[PDB]
Amino acid sequence: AAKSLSELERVNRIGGTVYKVIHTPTSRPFALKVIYGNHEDTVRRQICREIEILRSVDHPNVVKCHDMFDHNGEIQVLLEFMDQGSLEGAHIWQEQELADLSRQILSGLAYLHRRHIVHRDIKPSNLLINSAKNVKIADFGVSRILAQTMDPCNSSVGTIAYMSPERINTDLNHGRYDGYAGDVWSLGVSILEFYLGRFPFAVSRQGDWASLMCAICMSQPPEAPATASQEFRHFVSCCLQSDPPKRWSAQQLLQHPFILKA
Amino acid sequence: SELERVNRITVYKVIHTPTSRPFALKVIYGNHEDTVRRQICREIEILRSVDHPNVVKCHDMFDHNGEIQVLLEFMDQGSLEGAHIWQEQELADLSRQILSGLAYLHRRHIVHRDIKPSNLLINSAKNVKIADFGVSRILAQTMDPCNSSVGTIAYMSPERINTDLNHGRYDGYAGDVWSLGVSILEFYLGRFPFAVSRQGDWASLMCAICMSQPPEAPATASQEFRHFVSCCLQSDPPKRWSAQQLLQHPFILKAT
Amino acid sequence: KSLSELERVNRIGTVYKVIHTPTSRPFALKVIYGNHEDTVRRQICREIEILRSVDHPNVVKCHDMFDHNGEIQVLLEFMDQGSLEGAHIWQEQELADLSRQILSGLAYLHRRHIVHRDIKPSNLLINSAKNVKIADFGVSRILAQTMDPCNSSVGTIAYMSPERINTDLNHGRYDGYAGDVWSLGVSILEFYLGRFPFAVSRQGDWASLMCAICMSQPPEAPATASQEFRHFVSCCLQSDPPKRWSAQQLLQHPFILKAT
Amino acid sequence: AKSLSELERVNRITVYKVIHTPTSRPFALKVIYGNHEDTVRRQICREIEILRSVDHPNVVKCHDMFDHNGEIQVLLEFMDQGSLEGAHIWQEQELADLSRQILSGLAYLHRRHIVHRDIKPSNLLINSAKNVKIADFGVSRILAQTMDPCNSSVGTIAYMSPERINTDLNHGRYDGYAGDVWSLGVSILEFYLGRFPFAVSRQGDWASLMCAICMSQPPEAPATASQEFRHFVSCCLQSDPPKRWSAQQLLQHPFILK
């Protein structure tokens, strides 16, 4: 949706460093993000991962990049502009509304997962929403692409507050985790967070390591309050099983009775 | 966490002021480094899970400002360090309890790694509970070697010191059973069953433990007890019996 | 020949041209130095063994090796007309004849389980006789089995296969053989076009070279070329590495048979 | 012996000549210091293990060993004539009889799964009874099966095999057993020739010693020497490691049978 960077003029700063640019011929907004190529081997691997994921994805609930630029040995990606920002600290107590938000996020995550892309950082701040009240999955900074449908992930990446139990306590399984199931955990914490309007663990999300790990790995996982409907209660239980094969896939949750509501 | 700290034994003695009952209070401190953080995960997961008469159950956990304070069962008559128990019937009922807790920990794939009389607590009811899970690992499978040279030097099997045979990898189930056989024989003699001090240098401990034949019960002792310490102190670790397989030893049949 | 019989004449680019004073014969002399680092000590053992063992018309032969003053000096063939760097071949029989000779040497090296790892126009030497020989073995490795992965990031970024720049999926392991046949195919399409086939400075930033090689489709011969040469380059430049032909299989391609 | 206060330090051989003042018998005494590093400690526990097991006429056995002050004192039998270092022994019958003794001592350690990894004339000692014994175990290792490789590049460079210098081709791994049979045959040819059998000196740079022993052909005995002895060094000094004979295969070689 552009051709070159002479058409683009930076207008504001978004949110990593992201700008709002305006494409001068069309008067249309975009987001422009820079990915700079330093000499670290593990930063170069994540540059290659993020570049591949960004150009390949095409889904209404994954933020699409329209163009990419290698101005001066830094890569500049041209993303959709999401004008109403993140769903961070959004309170969706309306259960109908929550279900329509959750369906879109689930379409997106099911897309990424059936292309073997694990996101590894699903937090309300990475779920962006626009004027049209549609929601799209965003940051691929720590996200990975997998050679099989069942290839384990060994890297400790992401935000600890929304990490799966098996993504924090790594001793028994020797670091490896079902990256898919880990994302389905991260969604279910997010959707309960929208329902509760707080972080659904009884610890500050800025809290210390051992204070977060004791709430997530050592407690029973968060359940939706008994006030809520069965199908929402049963939805979060399909997401926040502490044993990972017990929890559903993203594809399966789209057929869950909570999400089948519009 | 509104009870009152009483006595320092770091581990505290506390009394819960509503019910005036005693407890033991251990602190666990949150670190920045992966081996200490995963040791907190290994320990704080074994403390909550365990439920056996011969294992120190903990009752509650608290987080104060990023440090985990864990509230354990208070053991009345302290530890068995120093202790001399030379009546076989008495030592057989004492051994029967420590094996029951250990055979429980092993079948839940928990290695202790620091079984010693310092961590075999006793109470006024004269019953015995396995104590300090600070070095303990939870294994994936029933055969899963441990690479970490940790525990207490004097009580650990020769393969936990002479690491170069299997490249640092040892059987942890046998690693505890050698640590138990040293501790039961230290009860029968009244002293550490090796020709050096436990608080010695590395090399002097290494020659005593790895290089001589493992210690034996004196021939004064009955054949049941002499057979039992050789079933725990084998030098090649698969010959050592499992903790459960020792509860059918006829030394243990002397209990009650 | 001895180290005091032959003396320096002129520098090739670090490696010198020497003349054997007794036989008045041109030769090339390369110094190999023994560093205190142990990864240096393996690379000498690899490079030296490769140089003595190779015996093929299309791979630069070693004639003598000298132990002087803790330095190993290797007497190589002299090549009269330098390298094929910057070369442009537009006559297709001229390019098939060049290709068949580079393929003969690479098929030799691959059966002797040597992966060269810096195939580029710079390291393809040509003499007055117009015979092409494969040159620089400073980054080459000699492999245990017929397939056995490489870990090391060595070579020129611009002539690496995508899987040597990227290192995600097989996590830095790569087929060294298939990595060479890519390096060959870029070198042969560089001859046809007269330019680097990729639209970026060869002496470029990592990130600009990464998007040009990994993240666009591999370059094709233009349609103005023959079908046999179009299909040949596509057999070398497969982005999935086992789709690439071996050097052995490419020697039987219809384009190579244009050499007569 | 019984104690450390029954020995008097006499002369330096760290290894010491000591005399047992009650028995008036000489023995050899070695210190191994407790080092901080987990890998020197790994070498300490290997070195001590090998000493206690050995029961052979042609291996230096230790009679007893002692500890005080975090230092391990090991008490070895005294070899009063010294080493076979610089021995120009050309007699095809006398050397046959020295090659009988080093092969009995080496074949004992190899079926007892111990790789010596520093065989040299310096570590081959001789007594007043002119019996020969294998000595320093500072680098030596004990292995799990008969079929276990070594990964460490230690010892002395000038008596290494090609496979112990050319580390890359087998990813640091070498046959320790046949790598001692090389080190043996280099010593046996060094005894016959009275010089080190390669072109360069021992003390030369690693680039000089590599091109002599990796990149040249391995040495042979001159054809003037007996077709038993010329064949003998051919069974020890192969460039290909499995083409070496076993040290127990060599005990019944025609050269060692003389």
Residue numbers in the entry:
A (entry chain A): 63 to 77, 82 to 328
B (entry chain D): 68 to 76, 83 to 329
C (entry chain H): 65 to 77, 83 to 329
D (entry chain G): 64 to 76, 83 to 327
Reported in the publication:
The MAPK kinases (MKKs) are dual specificity kinases, serving as convergence and divergence points of the tripartite MAPK cascades. AtMKK5 has been shown to play roles in plant growth and development processes, including the embryogenesis, stomatal development, floral organ abscission, stress response, and defense response. The full-length AtMKK5 contains a conventional kinase domain (residues 70–325) flanked by two flexible regions. Therefore, AtMKK5 is the effective upstream kinase of AtMPK6.
The structure was determined by molecular replacement, and each asymmetric unit contains eight molecules forming a double-layered ring. The overall structure of AtMKK5-KD exhibits the classical bilobal kinase fold, comprising a small N-lobe (residues 64–149) and a large C-lobe (150–329). Consequently, the prominent αC helix in the phosphorylated AtMKK5 adopts the typically active conformation, where the important Glu116 on helix αC interacts with Lys99 from strand β3. A charged or polar residue located on helix αD in the C-lobe of human MKKs can coordinate the ribose moiety of ATP; however, this αD helix is absent in the pAtMKK5-KD structure, replaced by a stretched loop (residues 152–157).
